Design an enzyme around this catalytic site. Structure first.
Site, PDB file in Angstrom:
ATOM      1  N   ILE A  71      -4.365   8.696   4.671  1.00  0.00           N
ATOM      2  CA  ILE A  71      -4.932   9.929   4.166  1.00  0.00           C
ATOM      3  C   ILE A  71      -5.446  10.791   5.333  1.00  0.00           C
ATOM      4  CG2 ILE A  71      -6.729  10.947   2.630  1.00  0.00           C
ATOM      5  CD1 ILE A  71      -6.148   8.745   0.554  1.00  0.00           C
ATOM      6  N   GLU A 160      -3.514   1.661  -0.461  1.00  0.00           N
ATOM      7  CA  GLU A 160      -3.476   0.184  -0.403  1.00  0.00           C
ATOM      8  C   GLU A 160      -2.699  -0.433  -1.559  1.00  0.00           C
ATOM      9  OE1 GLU A 160      -3.988  -1.011   2.353  1.00  0.00           O
ATOM     10  OE2 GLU A 160      -5.758  -0.160   3.283  1.00  0.00           O
ATOM     11  N   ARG A 163       0.965  -0.092  -0.799  1.00  0.00           N
ATOM     12  CA  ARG A 163       1.342  -1.083   0.174  1.00  0.00           C
ATOM     13  C   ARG A 163       1.569  -2.508  -0.332  1.00  0.00           C
ATOM     14  NH1 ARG A 163      -3.125   1.246   3.996  1.00  0.00           N
ATOM     15  NH2 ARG A 163      -2.054   2.762   5.293  1.00  0.00           N
TER      16      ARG A 163
HETATM   17  C1  LIG Z   1      -8.477   3.005  16.193  1.00  0.00           C
HETATM   18  C2  LIG Z   1      -8.173   3.739  14.878  1.00  0.00           C
HETATM   19  O1  LIG Z   1      -8.989   4.524  14.385  1.00  0.00           O
HETATM   20  N1  LIG Z   1      -6.963   3.439  14.358  1.00  0.00           N
HETATM   21  C3  LIG Z   1      -6.372   3.987  13.109  1.00  0.00           C
HETATM   22  C4  LIG Z   1      -5.840   5.425  13.378  1.00  0.00           C
HETATM   23  O2  LIG Z   1      -4.705   5.372  14.335  1.00  0.00           O
HETATM   24  C5  LIG Z   1      -3.476   4.647  14.012  1.00  0.00           C
HETATM   25  C6  LIG Z   1      -3.613   3.120  14.136  1.00  0.00           C
HETATM   26  C7  LIG Z   1      -2.378   5.112  14.970  1.00  0.00           C
HETATM   27  O3  LIG Z   1      -2.164   4.419  16.004  1.00  0.00           O
HETATM   28  O4  LIG Z   1      -1.783   6.163  14.642  1.00  0.00           O
HETATM   29  C8  LIG Z   1      -5.501   6.200  12.075  1.00  0.00           C
HETATM   30  O5  LIG Z   1      -5.131   7.579  12.363  1.00  0.00           O
HETATM   31  C9  LIG Z   1      -6.688   6.146  11.098  1.00  0.00           C
HETATM   32  C10 LIG Z   1      -6.294   6.805   9.773  1.00  0.00           C
HETATM   33  O6  LIG Z   1      -7.285   7.732   9.312  1.00  0.00           O
HETATM   34  O7  LIG Z   1      -6.993   4.763  10.789  1.00  0.00           O
HETATM   35  C11 LIG Z   1      -7.335   3.874  11.919  1.00  0.00           C
HETATM   36  O8  LIG Z   1      -7.245   2.527  11.446  1.00  0.00           O
END
Ligand SMILES: CC(=O)N[C@@H]1[C@@H](O[C@H](C)C(=O)O)[C@H](O)[C@@H](CO)O[C@H]1O
Ligand SMILES: *[C@@H]1O[C@H](CO)[C@@H](O)[C@H](O)[C@H]1NC(C)=O
Length: 246
Positions: A71, A160, A163
């Site tokens: 999201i 979720e 998924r």
């Molecule tokens: C460290 C962190 O915040 N990781 C991810 C983000 O990055 C992902 C893993 C990526 O590598 O694109 C992702 O944009 C947001 C979604 O809102 O959720 C987190 O779990």
């Protein structure tokens, strides 16, 4: 676009919504008979619009990144809201540009950050169809603290559930009464990236995980997933995060 209406919703209409959402996400390949989400999409096509209607018929439209089911932001009347993270800021270049004004939420979209804003882990937040009706209602009017808990609900009952069929089923059992998620539900959420990666590594490795994934099972016990023959892979997971995005 995909849509879901809480007014008259039942396990069946919710299942149709989750089916629709999975179906809206593009893939060119299946790995072990699971759709493998794309490495990348360029432009506005990377975003799916989800129109969600609360019981009173009031609506928000949620923007979802089709490559990872994350999201990014949502529109409620004339105001757009986006997470405070670069992928969301990028999304705001493509969706809800029509909004009268744009608010950047005072947190990013990850679980740890939302739980902090919300003041409770999601272990303690009930989820279900009534909780989703509440979440849409809440997001209708800006309140960043209440919005964090609503977004924890919204993420779990949409993304979720797309998924994992086990998560979709858990929500279905919660059509008319909310309940905190099972520890198995929590485990699958936290393991999605790892599972997607290990399922991908298993091609070229005889169906065998390079590294095992530990889950809690729907009977409360801790367990190791080691290869593609596990019920987690054959029946449960519905979408693979591509290893390029891992
Ligand atoms: C460290 C962190 O915040 N990781 C991810 C983000 O990055 C992902 C893993 C990526 O590598 O694109 C992702 O944009 C947001 C979604 O809102 O959720 C987190 O779990
Ligand atoms: C494959 O997974 C199944 C299901 O848990 C398990 O019984 C079996 O030991 C695993 N085999 C290998 C080689 O990992």
């Amino acid at each position: 676009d995909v849509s879901f209406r809480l007014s008259g919703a039942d396990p069946s209409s919710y299942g149709m919504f989750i089916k629709d959402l999975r179906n809206a996400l593009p893939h060119t390949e299946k790995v072990y008979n699971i759709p493998l989400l794309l490495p990348s999409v360029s432009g506005a096509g990377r975003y799916l619009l989800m129109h969600l209607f609360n019981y009173d018929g009031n609506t928000i439209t949620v923007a979802v990144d089709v490559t990872n089911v994350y999201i990014m932001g949502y529109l409620a009347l004339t105001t757009s809201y986006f997470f405070n993270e670069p992928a969301a800021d990028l999304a705001s270049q493509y969706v809800f540009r029509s909004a009268r004004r744009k608010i950047t939420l005072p947190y990013s979209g990850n679980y740890e950050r939302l739980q902090i804003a919300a003041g409770k882990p999601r272990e303690k937040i009930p989820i279900g169809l009534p909780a989703l009706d509440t979440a849409i209602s809440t997001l209708l009017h800006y309140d960043s603290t209440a919005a964090a808990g609503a977004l924890l609900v919204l993420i779990q009952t949409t993304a979720e559930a797309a998924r994992f069929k086990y998560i979709e089923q858990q929500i279905q059992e919660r059509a008319y009464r909310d309940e905190v998620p099972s520890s198995a539900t929590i485990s699958l959420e936290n393991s999605w990236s790892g599972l997607s990666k290990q399922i991908q590594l298993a091609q070229g490795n005889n169906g065998v995980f390079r590294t095992p994934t530990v889950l809690v099972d729907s009977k409360g016990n801790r367990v190791q997933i080691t290869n593609v023959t596990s019920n987690v892979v054959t029946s449960n997971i519905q979408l693979l995060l591509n290893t390029k995005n891992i």
